[PDB]
Amino acid sequence: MWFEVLPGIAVMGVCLFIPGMATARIHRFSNGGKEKRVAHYPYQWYLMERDRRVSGVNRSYVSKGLENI
Amino acid sequence: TYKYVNLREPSMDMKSVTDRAAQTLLWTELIRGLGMTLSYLFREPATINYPFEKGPLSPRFRGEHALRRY
Amino acid sequence: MMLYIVFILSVIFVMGFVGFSSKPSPIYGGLGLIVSGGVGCGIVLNFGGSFLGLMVFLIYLGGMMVVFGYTTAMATEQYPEIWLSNKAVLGAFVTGLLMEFFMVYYVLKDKEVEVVFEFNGLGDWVIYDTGDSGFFSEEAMGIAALYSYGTWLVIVTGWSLLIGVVVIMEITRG
Amino acid sequence: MNLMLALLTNFTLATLLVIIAFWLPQLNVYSARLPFSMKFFLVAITFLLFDLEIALLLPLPWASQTANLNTMLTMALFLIILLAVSLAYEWTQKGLEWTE
Amino acid sequence: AERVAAFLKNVWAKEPVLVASFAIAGLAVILPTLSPYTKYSLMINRATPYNYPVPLRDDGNMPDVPSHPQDPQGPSLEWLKRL
Amino acid sequence: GEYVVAKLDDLINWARRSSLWPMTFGLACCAVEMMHMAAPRYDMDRFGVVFRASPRQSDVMIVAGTLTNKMAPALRKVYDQMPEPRYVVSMGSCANGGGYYHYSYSVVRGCDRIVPVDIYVPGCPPTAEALLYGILQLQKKIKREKRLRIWYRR
Amino acid sequence: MFMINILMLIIPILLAVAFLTLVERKVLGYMQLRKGPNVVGPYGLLQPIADAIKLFIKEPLATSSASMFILAPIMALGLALTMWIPLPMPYPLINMNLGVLFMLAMSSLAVYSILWSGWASNSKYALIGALRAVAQTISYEVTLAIILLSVLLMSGSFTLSTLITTQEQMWLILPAWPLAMMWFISTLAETNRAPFDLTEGESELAGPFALFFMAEYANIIMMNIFTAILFLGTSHNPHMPELYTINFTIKSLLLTMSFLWIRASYPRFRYDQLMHLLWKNFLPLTLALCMWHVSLPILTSGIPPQT
Ligand SMILES: CCCCCCCCCCCCCCCCCC(=O)OC[C@H](COP(=O)(O)OCCN)OC(=O)CCCCCCCCCCCCCCCCC
Ligand SMILES: CCCCCCCCCCCCO[C@@H]1O[C@H](CO)[C@@H](O[C@H]2O[C@H](CO)[C@@H](O)[C@H](O)[C@H]2O)[C@H](O)[C@H]1O
Ligand SMILES: CCCCCCCCCCCCO[C@@H]1O[C@H](CO)[C@@H](O[C@H]2O[C@H](CO)[C@@H](O)[C@H](O)[C@H]2O)[C@H](O)[C@H]1O
Ligand SMILES: N=C(N)NC(=N)NCCc1ccc(I)c(Cl)c1
Ligand code: SF4
């Protein structure tokens, strides 16, 4: 019956789910649990490089708030 | 007695012309073909599970020869 | 070091040019030009020419050079002669290759060199711009301006492409 | 660096797959003109010329951000119309026919 | 006119793809001049501040120039909010 | 040593018999029963036997019909272009040994005069089911191969 | 960390391609009132593995130029994997500001593998078949590029993840279904899929083979993923990105399955007829719709943001 086509479709679907799910979780792991910063324009790169200096550990994804004021 | 397979005149009124325009641009007859193959996807297949299942034969079947006894 | 990436790409650029300029079979000459085109895009990319770099890939490689190979397969060579089997090609290839290496050796040893003209050898990074914090791509703004400032450029360019079609149909009708 | 790594990985893997694909244990001990057709040449050339016009249109999404929209819209349409005229000329001169 | 309609019916029957192409291309050329909304496209693009708005040296004779961003003088985007 | 060679043989045998791609030489009426074997009732594809493969991608040649003298050179040429391992299935009386036309001046008296044959399927024509039995018999022949075991003992 | 990410994309792509061959055979089978693979593993789940092993231990059966004989499959497979690295699912492996142009640029290079393999065939007739395939591919590149540009005039940029934002409220297939139709057909013709499978058609009138097959089937999946993003945008929830990945995978699977559905439903085009479909039908409409989509945002004051 037609639903015997599903197991092959399920395997294919799991194979295509892995890339997107892996990229998202690797990004969170590498960026302190947040989304990876997008810098398409010089202004965003400038802020990211300023964040790196302000972080105190050379990590643009480590944020300092009013505790540093 | 005979019949014509393909001797018809398309209606040239605006409604009929626009119907053919819609078929040309919206691929209606092609979509109608997709419906047929879709309906076969959901039909039980005709395949049998050989060699666990066998095609039907009759007593008249002509197979391998043999010499018989009384 | 990665700080010399543009220079390293430029060196590869020259070797690819010596490749097809010594003129092996046009099949291989076309290959050498394709490798130089890709490397040429990389040089442009590292100067902030993202859109310009990708146009070399899209248009120069994916368009013009595809048509070159298509025409070569159809009207020039169908089977390539073994590369460098010809003496003049091998001599020209070796001659150019040695000239490039002698250039590259000295500029790296002295961080400068005078090959007819004076060239600094500290690395192309030294001339880069030190302030950039705009919210847009300057290359994109300049290219987009074709439709606001470059009315006259659009007219003559568009006209020439139409005449290109007309002319080529005339040439080939015979 | 990431894009360079990705490209190097993709093509390095492709090279390796070709390698083992050509060398596995086997277990055995024992420049003329290619019947040139002018029509296929003109398809390639026509593609080239249309590809160069596409190169000119690619900036359009950015151009729409201008304050000079009157000029920008007029030039955008002018370019596309000239592309249509090119197609119309080729069409009416039998350049899109595959007979003869 | 009647000859115009007969011509259009003929092409509609034989070349609907080309008829649609020309009709769409004609609308693209004509409709911007007839649309009441085309004027806002100019205004919205101009209202997007890409670079810094450099302040003016106050000479005491600029009653139309705001002193603070929240002062009333200067362009307003209230038309854009309601759009 | 023995265990690895045996298991590896089982693996390559299973892959080769589970993915048998036939080149069918549909010479005459036996080709019709071959089409019926591909048809829904028997569905040779469900065994991993694709419907029609290119000769250079093929693993088994099915000679389905009378092989004439005029055709014999062409059939041998296709067989020689097949990549190994390659097998031949002779289908029906004509290909098996000439059949009804055995005594004709224009007919090869069995395709095994031209190519080596792995399986002979009798019948004029064999039924689609008979041919399928033959294909499965070929699968079992492939399952018996011990190429690596013999290689190890050279 | 990044090398792990690359491999968590490369490996699943090849596995997805392997099992698409099974899905294709079984979907075609059931539309043909039969079953397709169901003996080699339960429901045929080991069939791709048997086929893969078989092809790689087959005799690898003279090339007119060894360098190009090997270059063509490396180019095909390397380029095919490269087309995946900017795809947002929802986050791309590489976030390119001009990702759409990159995909257009890389796809235009894929025709070299056709050209090079025709040169290396060492046969006059195989070179001619390659040139016919190239002419088809570049012909449909024209409409694909113009259709893509038309859509981006509603998105505002060449960034692929911006298409997600553009379709936050509504799929782009609603304002652009005429373009979606020609885009979808163009992808079929671009990948030499039925009814545009003229290379396999006209032709009949081991490891290296497998490699070209993997490249083509990777391109088929990728093109339908691109179609899903371009016209059937999935909503992204930044705190639950897996929700996006599930919905977007289902759409891509269904689009891929419709490629098989279409193969099962129609006869083949003649070569001259598929050329007329492009140059005399799609291209006129694409040009007219390109003018229309340039004008529409301006005349509705719906110009998207640059960023
Ligand atoms: C108010 C202002 C409005 C302004 C905008 C107005 C625009 C909208 C109105 C116009 C509608 C445009 C429709 C565009 C679709 C393209 C139409 C087309 O090109 O069809 C014609 C083409 C050739 O037709 P033919 O009969 O062979 O001959 C005609 C020429 N002699 O026929 C074909 O193309 C056939 C295609 C062959 C391929 C067959 C396989 C595909 C079948 C399944 C398709 C499923 C639909 C795809 C959906 C994709 C989803 C992502
Ligand atoms: C073979 C050559 C073919 C060349 C084809 C050229 C076709 C050009 C057709 C449209 C050109 C003008 O198109 C449109 O017209 C209206 C006229 O009110 C202009 O005016 C509109 O926008 C401007 C903004 O600049 C507003 O100030 C104005 O209030 C508004 O009405 C638009 O700015 C212009 O975008
Ligand atoms: C995807 C990973 C798969 C891993 C599987 C690893 C298994 C390694 C053992 C492979 C054994 C292959 O077995 C062997 O394959 C080659 C393929 O040409 C066949 O062919 C070979 O032998 C024949 C003669 O017998 C020669 O004429 C031929 O030129 C040669 O190619 C052999 O007939 C077959 O016996
Ligand atoms: N066209 C089909 N869907 N069937 C089919 N016989 N495909 C080709 C089989 C194949 C090729 C390469 C690999 I890797 C794998 Cl696993 C399977
Ligand atoms: S064996 Fe019988 S059925 Fe087969 S080709 Fe010969 S005559 Fe025809």
Task: Specify the number of domains making up chain C.
Answer: 1
Structure-token match 């039980």, residue found: B44
B21 touches E at CB < 8 Å: yes
The pairing of beta strand C117-120 with beta strand F22-26 = unpaired
Domain-embedded: residue C33: yes
Q: Is G44 left (phi over 0), alpha (psi -120 to 50) or beta?
A: left
Angle, CA of G228, G234 and G237, to the nearest 5°:
150
The CB density around residue F67, as the number of other CB atoms within 10 Å, is 27
Q: Do the chains contact at C80 and G64, CB–CB below 8 Å?
A: yes
d(CA G114, ligand 4 centre) in Å? 20
Instruction: Report CA-CA distances (Å) from B48 to F31, F37, F44, F127, G38.
Output: 21, 11, 11, 15, 12
Q: Which atom of ligand 2 is nearest to the CA of E32?
A: 14
Nearest 5°: phi and psi at C136? -155, 165
CA-CA distance, G298 to E39, in Å (whole number)? Answer: 9
- DSSP letters along chain A, please? -GGGGHHHHHHHHHHHHHHHHHHHHHHHHHTTTSPPPP--SHHHHHHHHHHHHHHSSS-TTS---GGG-
CA-CA distance, G61 to G266, in Å (whole number)? Answer: 34
Asked whether the beta carbons of G237 and G244 are under 8 A apart, the reply is yes
Residues 6+ apart with CB under 8 A from E22: G288
Residues of C in contact with G97 (CB under 8 A): 50, 137
Domain-embedded: residue C141: yes
Structure-token match 């919205």, residue found: E44
A42 touches G at CB < 8 Å: no
**Cβ–ligand 4 contact at G210 (below 6 Å):** yes
Structure-token match 């296709």, residue found: F78
Chain B interface, best mutation among G34, G181, G184, G265, by max B CB count within 10 A: G265
Angle, CA of G123, G126 and G132, to the nearest 5°:
145
CA-CA distance, D91 to D83, in Å (whole number)? Answer: 12
**Cβ–ligand 1 contact at G69 (below 6 Å):** no
Residues of A in contact with C133 (CB under 8 A): 42-43, 46
**Cβ–ligand 4 contact at G16 (below 6 Å):** no
- DSSP letters along chain G, please? -HHHHHHHHHHHHHHHHHHHHHHHHHHHHHHTTS--S-TTTGGGTTHHHHHHHHHHTS-----S-HHHHHHHHHHHHHHHHHTTTT--SSS-SS--TTHHHHHHHHHHHTHHHHHHHHHHT--HHHHHHHHHHHHHHHHHHHHHHHHHHHHHHHH-SS-HHHHHHHTSSS-TTTTTHHHHHHHHHHHHHHTT-TTS-HHHHHHH--HHHHHHHHHHHHHHHHHHHHHHHHHSPPP--TT-HHHHHHHHHHHHHHHHHHHHHHHTT--PPPHHHHHHIIIIIIHHHHHHHHHHHHHHHHHHT-PPP--
Domain-embedded: residue C81: yes
B20 touches E at CB < 8 Å: yes
- Residue type at G83? M
Task: Specify the number of domains making up chain D.
Answer: 1
E68 touches D at CB < 8 Å: no
Q: Which atom of ligand 2 is nearest to the CA of E29?
A: 9
Residue of the nearest CA to atom 1 in ligand 4? G21
For B11-35, give one letter per residue: b (16+ CB within 10 A) or e: eeeeeebeebbeeebeeeeeeeebe
**Cβ–ligand 1 contact at G281 (below 6 Å):** yes
The CB density around residue C122, as the number of other CB atoms within 10 Å, is 12
Cα C127 to the center of its chain, rounded Å: 22
Domain-embedded: residue D60: yes
Q: Which of C87, C64, C69, C89 has the alpha carbon at shortest distance from C27?
A: C69
Structure-token match 């092993």, residue found: G53
- Residue type at B43? R
The pairing of beta strand F60-64 with beta strand F87-91 = parallel
Would you tell me the crossing angle of helices C151-173 and D69-92 to the nearest 10 degrees?
A: 10
CA-CA distance, G103 to A13, in Å (whole number)? Answer: 23
Q: Do the chains contact at G104 and C58, CB–CB below 8 Å?
A: yes
- DSSP letters along C8-77, please? HHHHHHHHHHHHHHT---HHHHHHHHHHHHHHHHHHHHTTT-HHHHHHIIIIIIIIIIHHHHHHHHHHT-
Between the CA atoms of G211, G213, G216 and G222, what dihedral angle is there, to the nearest 10 degrees? -80
Pocket test for ligand 2, best of D65, D66, D70, D75 (most atoms within 8 A of CB): D70
Asked whether the beta carbons of A64 and A52 are under 8 A apart, the reply is no
Q: Do the chains contact at C172 and D38, CB–CB below 8 Å?
A: yes
Residue of the nearest CA to atom 16 in ligand 2? E33
Q: Which of G263, G291, G284, G283 has the alpha carbon at shortest distance from G141?
A: G283
Computed from CA positions of residues F87, F91, F95, F98, in that sequence, does the dihedral angle turn out positive or negative? positive
Residue of the nearest CA to atom 16 in ligand 3? D26
Asked whether the beta carbons of F65 and F78 are under 8 A apart, the reply is no
G208 touches F at CB < 8 Å: no
d(CA A62, ligand 3 centre) in Å? 57
The pairing of beta strand C117-120 with beta strand C112-115 = antiparallel
CA-CA distance, G133 to G142, in Å (whole number)? Answer: 15
CA-CA distance, D28 to F150, in Å (whole number)? Answer: 11
The domain ranges of chain A are 1-69
> Do the chains F and E touch each other, judged by at least 3 C-beta pairs below 8 angstroms?
no
**Cβ–ligand 2 contact at D81 (below 6 Å):** yes
* Token pair belonging to G168: 């936050």
**Cβ–ligand 2 contact at D14 (below 6 Å):** no
| Nearest CB neighbour to D22, from listed G7, G60, G82 | G60
**DSSP character at residue F46:** G
Domain-embedded: residue D50: yes
**Cβ–ligand 5 contact at F90 (below 6 Å):** no
Burial bucket for residue G113 (CB in 10 Å: 0-12, 13-18, 19+): buried
E27 touches D at CB < 8 Å: no
d(CA F134, ligand 5 centre) in Å? 16
Residues of B in contact with A1 (CB under 8 A): 44-45
User: Is F111 labelled a binding residue?
Assistant: no
Residue of the nearest CA to atom 8 in ligand 4? G21
Whether residue B51 has a cis bond before it, omega within 30° of 0: yes
Between the CA atoms of G241, G247, G248 and G249, what dihedral angle is there, to the nearest 10 degrees? 110
* Token pair belonging to C5: 């990436």
d(CA F96, ligand 5 centre) in Å? 10
d(CA G45, ligand 4 centre) in Å? 13
* Structure resolution, Å: 2.3
Cα G47 to the center of its chain, rounded Å: 24
**DSSP character at residue F59:** S
D80 touches C at CB < 8 Å: no
- Residue type at F145? E
Domain-embedded: residue C174: no
Burial bucket for residue D9 (CB in 10 Å: 0-12, 13-18, 19+): buried
Q: Do the chains contact at G292 and E37, CB–CB below 8 Å?
A: no
Q: Do the chains contact at D81 and E41, CB–CB below 8 Å?
A: no
Alpha carbon of C41: minimum distance to chain G alpha carbons (Å): 12
Residue of the nearest CA to atom 25 in ligand 3? D28
**CATH number for position C132:** 1.20.120.1200
**DSSP character at residue C157:** H
Q: Do the chains contact at F147 and D29, CB–CB below 8 Å?
A: no
* Token pair belonging to G143: 């409409």
**Solved with:** cryo-EM
| Ligand with minimal distance to G299 CA | 2
Angle, CA of G301, G302 and G304, to the nearest 5°:
130
**CATH number for position D47:** 1.20.58.1610
Domain that holds residue D57: 7-92
Half-sphere exposure of residue C22: CA atoms within 13 angstroms, side-chain side: 24
Q: Do the chains contact at G266 and B40, CB–CB below 8 Å?
A: no
Domain that holds residue C106: 4-169
Residue of the nearest CA to atom 2 in ligand 2? D78
